[PDB]
Amino acid sequence: MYAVIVTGGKQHKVTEGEFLKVEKLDVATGEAIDFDRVLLVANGEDVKIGLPVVEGAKVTAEVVSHGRHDKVRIIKFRRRKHHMKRQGHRQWFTEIKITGIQA
């Protein structure tokens, strides 16, 4: 039981139970999500890969929470030229949980 699902322009290595952090998606908290963009499904040793998408397979996940992890800093400095500029950034995310794999 491991799948390769594609959430947000990037794919993952999901094996069920999965407190897994995804970029922010438009759904409330406590709703079930189906991923239909799975690329290979393995089971025991029985492993099959998708010509582009493997057929029939779904991964069921549900949203634990929302949050916003970090505080990264930006300094755009030029020496000897009288210029300096700062800016903060915190990126949203969405923690989900896989109760998923369906071959």
Binding site: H82, H83, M84, K85
Partner: protein, 72 residues
């Protein structure tokens, strides 16, 4: 209420202070530039001075006359 009222938007401005910081835009020079006359304390060019070329008000002829009688 004196705790309430304030003027119209745009009626008051806030007198930009040259020489503070780098973010404000006026720092380290105050809009003057670099070396020269109009960069120093009392960099006043005299009015009408051109640089050494003969100015306008010393090339053209005097031509007036003031009568007296338009004072009445």
């Amino acid at each position: 209420q004196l705790n309430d009222l304030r003027s119209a938007p745009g009626a008051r401005r806030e007198k930009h202070r040259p020489g503070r910081g780098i973010g404000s835009g006026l720092g380290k020079t105050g809009g003057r530039g670099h070396k020269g006359l109009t960069s120093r304390s009392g960099g006043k060019v005299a009015p009408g001075f051109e640089g050494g070329q003969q100015p306008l008000h010393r090339r053209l002829p005097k031509f007036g006359f003031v009568s007296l009688k338009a004072m009445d």
